[PDB]
Swiss-Prot record:
Domain of life: Bacteria
Any single Gene Ontology cellular-component annotation: cytoplasm
UniProt name for this protein: Large ribosomal subunit protein bL33
Family, similarity comment: Belongs to the bacterial ribosomal protein bL33 family.
RNA sequence: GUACGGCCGCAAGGUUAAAACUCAAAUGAAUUGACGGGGGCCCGCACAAGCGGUGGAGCAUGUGGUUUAAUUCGAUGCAAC
RNA sequence: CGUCGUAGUCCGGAUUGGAGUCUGCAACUCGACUCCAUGAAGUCGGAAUCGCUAGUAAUCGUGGAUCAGAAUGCCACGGUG
RNA sequence: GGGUGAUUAGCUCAGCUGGGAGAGCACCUCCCUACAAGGAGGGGGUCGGCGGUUCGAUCCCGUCAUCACCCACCA
RNA sequence: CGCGGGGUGGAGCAGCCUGGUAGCUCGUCGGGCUCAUAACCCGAAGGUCGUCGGUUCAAAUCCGGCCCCCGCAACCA
RNA sequence: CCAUAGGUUAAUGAGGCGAACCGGGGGAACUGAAACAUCUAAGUACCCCGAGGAAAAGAAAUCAACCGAGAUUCCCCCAG
RNA sequence: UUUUGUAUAAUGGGUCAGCGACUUAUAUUCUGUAGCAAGGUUAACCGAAUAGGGGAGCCGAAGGGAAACCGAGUCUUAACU
RNA sequence: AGGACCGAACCGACUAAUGUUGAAAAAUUAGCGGAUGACUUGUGGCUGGGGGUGAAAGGCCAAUCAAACCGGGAGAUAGCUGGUUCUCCCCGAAAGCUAUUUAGGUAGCGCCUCGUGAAUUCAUCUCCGGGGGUAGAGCACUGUUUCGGCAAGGGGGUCAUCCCGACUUACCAACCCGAUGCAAACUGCGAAUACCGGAGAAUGUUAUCACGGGAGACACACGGCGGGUGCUAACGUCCGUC
RNA sequence: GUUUAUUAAAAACACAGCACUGUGCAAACACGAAAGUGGACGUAUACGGUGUGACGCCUGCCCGGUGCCGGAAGGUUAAUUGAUGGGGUUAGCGCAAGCGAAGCUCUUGAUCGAAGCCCCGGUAAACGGCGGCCGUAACUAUAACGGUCCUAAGGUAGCGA
RNA sequence: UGAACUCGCUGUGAAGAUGCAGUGUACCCGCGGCAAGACGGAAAGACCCCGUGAACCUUUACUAUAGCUUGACACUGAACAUUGAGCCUUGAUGUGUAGGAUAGGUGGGAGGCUUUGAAGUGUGGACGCCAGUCUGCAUGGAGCCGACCUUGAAAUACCACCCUUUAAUGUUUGAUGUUCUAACGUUGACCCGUAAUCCGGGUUGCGGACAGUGUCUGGUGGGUAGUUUGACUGGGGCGGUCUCCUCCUAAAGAGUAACGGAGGAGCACGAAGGUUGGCUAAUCCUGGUCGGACAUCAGGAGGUUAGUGCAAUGGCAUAAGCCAGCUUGACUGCGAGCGUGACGGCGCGAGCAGGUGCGAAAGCAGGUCAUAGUGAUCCGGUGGUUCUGAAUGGAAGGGCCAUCGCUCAACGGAUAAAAGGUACUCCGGGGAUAACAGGCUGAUACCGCCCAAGAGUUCAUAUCGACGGCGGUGUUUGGCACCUCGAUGUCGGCUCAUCACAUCCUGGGGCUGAAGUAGGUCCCAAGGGUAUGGCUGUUCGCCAUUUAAAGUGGUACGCGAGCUG
RNA sequence: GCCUGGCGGCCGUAGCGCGGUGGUCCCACCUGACCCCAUGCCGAACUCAGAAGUGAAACGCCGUAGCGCCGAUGGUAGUGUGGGGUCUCCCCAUGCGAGAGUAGGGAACUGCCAGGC
């Protein structure tokens, strides 16, 4: 048994992602996270695994 | 036909064949019942099948088990309660 | 003729809550009746096995015997069939 | 000598937070029906002996003895 | 010394390992076929699935001790 | 039959020997990898064949890099 | 001689004699010493084989960065910090 | 006739004895035994190294053999073994840390040492300040505990159910009054000594530091002291420590 | 009869006979890096492989595992076949992005097939295997007995401190 | 064969003296004869233990191979038939609905086409809108078709392109069998070389597209061969431990040993993070409906004796505990410096820019209450890359930047690939390490004394003793690991010594539950004494008969340079 | 001197028991609640506006040497270094020295600012 790491995609319109461990057996519903990005040098939301 | 020896067989076997112990018996025939998953003709409501029930609830009225001081003694398959 | 409408309740009535009817020496405990509320079980019954046939089954009325007092029991009468 | 168990009815024995007398067969009697069957009540218990504790030692636990069965010495 | 398991109606053995959940045969207590018993058939009565805490929607089941056991191995110099 | 295998006669070539070197053939294990198989060690060791005064190589369907080389072998280097 | 440690009942020695052991081979560097010095040095070979030539090649004086690329600077870097 | 009874020649190993630096590379003396056979033997051949030969012991294979003998790779390899040199001097270790197919070696730290450059290296005494909980002391809190008394509730037993329900607490355990033992794992207290640095006196060592070169050791043993362990035993055991 | 030279001599080994297995003969089988020979100038009353041990009386069950045979229909399935598509290059095309003809070079995987193995049946005189627990008579004790966990199945005949 | 004026004790000593301490004994050397002693001699011990030594014994360890088995393709052929499989080739197709009319799709379109072909229209076969077409007939046999009429996006001669389903001809390729020689073969026969069993040449039969063999290859194969094959432990095996975290033993710094004393980890929370605002327990008692025995919360009594992701340690209400909002700082790239381990690795942190969030602002925010939650190096796969790929330009490839993973967990990891056994071995080292013996100790062992619950019909102590205590002994069973593994013969059997005294017998006698004879018990004493028969490897044991006894112990539990084995 | 409030310092001499004591001043109760503000509901809390009531609770001071707390001198426990022995203890030399109690101390002291007499 493992919680597994999933990739949330940046609102920068690219394939760039942030990985987090998110167990489908405790919280399967979608998540969106605000983080800093050093390429746009400002904060963006990372959302959804597909 | 159990035991012992002798004879005979490749062998399974073939032959001779007791004693002790124990019981008023073993056994042939004919006779009449009764019994059968036996026979033939047959009847019963017995089987069957068209229905009603008792078996489940609560209450009553008898019989066992349980129990005390007595909780009475028998009847108790068809033939009781 | 109106009215309710398969419901563990609407139908069903047990152990209740209260006051009354009665015989007798006397019904607290073992008896019956009545009136006004309350209320449990009860949705045709386990295996199995029991009884029948026209005025018979089922169904609804009445009397009487036993008896100080009390039986849906016992013995007779009749309607619907 | 020592080791580990047993000691409760003739023979076999049950009973592990310490409140234990009970069963089978053995021995009699009654009802059964004349007996066996079936049913019931009785006769017989050092629950081994002796210390410490205690409300009290089948159990906390020391020791004596008999039965059980087993050792030491060459490895 | 332990290791892995077991903890079940009276006896012997299932289920478990998937919480929505105590079972079968021999027995014990009666019904049915019987004259009568057994088989067979239909019914009943029964287990705190060790013990105290914990975790939980919940604990015979998981988690920690304690406690009683089964089996395997209890000899190497 | 002719023929030819076979038979005979004459001639040439080889044969055996000689120190070391040398082309080709057969071909390890140890050793190192502080351990072992690939890799290293080694085409060594030893054995075999064969041959010359030397054996072996060569002047390109080779080697470079747009510059060009213009046979091979031997030496110092390229280069740890 | 072995050992922390042996007069040691711990191994060893009959005795005299001839014998018997840390090197040179190569690369690089540290030290010494010296020549030259931002330079130093030659190898094979040539040659008058202990002269003189031969500087091919090597060691050195510039660094930063995987590297492209930059250079008294440079990589990190939007950068100055 | 004979895988027949005894038995010369012929063969031959079983018992016994002698021998055992011998006569001896296996014999000698006496006996029992093999002797038409699955036998024995004269003479010459044939079977070879993981191959032979074996009615089969890994016995025999020229004395050798869980793999013969000689010559080569080979002076293979040995964290081991021991052999490792004539004469005066300067400084002066270790058997500890950390890692390793690690507990026989080796590698970073501790300990030894030579050169080079720049230089005093240190402690004891007194007092002041600072981080400090061992020794001792203790019962407050934890856990444990004795003695005396009261004792909720739980676990056990009993009799009443009318007397205000009552007796009992050997067991498990809360409250409480009065006392006492234990503690590495506790604290209503805590030294001696040690260690760090000032303020101050006294004494004498060429020192300390960096760089550039070499090491040696990381299996020692013992008496005392500080503590566990062992039977408050061992020339026993495991450490600290002088 | 055989058994090792000088401490290990018999019960071990061989033998008369017993069984199973391979062999139709240019046998099967073996040695020979082979040329060849042995098998054997033997031919099923004859040879190769392995165990048994004269003679007399004699031979229970198990094919799950590991071997072997009968069946090859089915499954599993390889090298190989290599339908489809992609990567590299390139004449060429478009403003660029981005596209791209042919030939080459790499690559992919639609999918087939032998033997084995599995599957079905047999094979133990093939290598082998032949188990436990619980309860139970009319004293003690035992169980002819009944169950129960399991295995491929868990001992007919004979011997036994 | 070290040198030797090499006598005995009790001590000491790497603990057995000859050589050291004390003490005791002795004239010296030949001749013959014997051996207790000189840790004996020949052999670096075989055996026991340790171990990044060797060799066998084995096995689906790793790997290979002889032997065997499997298929295409080749030396190596003519062809024939019958057909499994794939593939090419071709025809029928094709409608509804309303109307002549089955327009398949679709691109062209008036002179062009069918003779192996159309009609009939059905008997009968498939399909079916029952019409029609095909298989093949009854059967004929060069045509035909368009206008007018009218459907529809679209036309009905003539001619391309595209197809479902399906069979036969063809074709590639496996089977089944067919004849027949020529690759191949004869362990057939004959003639000749040749008074030759081989070989060569010829002859004449019979086999054979078989065999034999090769390239490549699926599979097998301990028969043969090379190699790998964990550790700690005041002994081994089972068990435990092996990397990470904490406390105590542990010493008024740290380190610091013991299967000394005891517990945890190899992750989880997008929330339980951030920040601003508000608040804070336990426990008992009292008291009250819908509530079956108990669901309510208010008050007092009182406590930092509640809560926190978990070990133990310590923190925490200024809360890190419980909530309310806003929120995502669970921030990026970096960094003076400090602490720390030998390094790997890591914690703390001033300072800079950029972008967020809470708040009035100060101030805080580059994660959770802290201490455990992994796998390097090597590398396969993949996306990017205005780094590079050495003839030039691309590019397999190498680098850089993203993305992931080996319980390799023997954890700090010996290699795309490695397991067991040796009493059949065997090598280097050793009492560093056990066994038979020497030392140390005396719990164990046997005994006495202090003392006394009791037994001894009274009575504790004649004789005997549960309990507690303190010794006598060297001495056993064990503990222990010093001197011993270049080699101390072990058990029993025979044959034969020396010293003790803890006395079995022999001499002495005491106490007594001793009148006497005895029994029970005590101690002065080691001068003399202390069997034999049967069974067994034999002590140990048992049995029968003898005896003043049928004593105990030390001497490696005495006598292998003694006998037996 | 005295009284109080804030920041506090020091933190038991600052404690406990029991008693006394203040409303000019400050301090708390108190007296009300639109608005800004607040409530999973509420002027309860938070918050505002103030003087009719009071010196109670709350806040602050103080007497009291009974106990806590601090604790001399003497002795004790322990101990650094040294000598011995009768040996995990004792004896000696030479230094250090708690813990508890006693006598004594002690019912504090104070920096900055501000109000009051």
């Amino acid at each position: 048994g493992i919680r597994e790491k999933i990739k949330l995609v940046s609102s920068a319109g690219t394939g760039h992602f942030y990985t987090t461990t998110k167990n489908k057996r405790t919280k399967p519903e979608k998540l969106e996270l605000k983080k800093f990005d050093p390429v746009v040098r400002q904060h963006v939301i990372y959302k959804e695994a597909k």
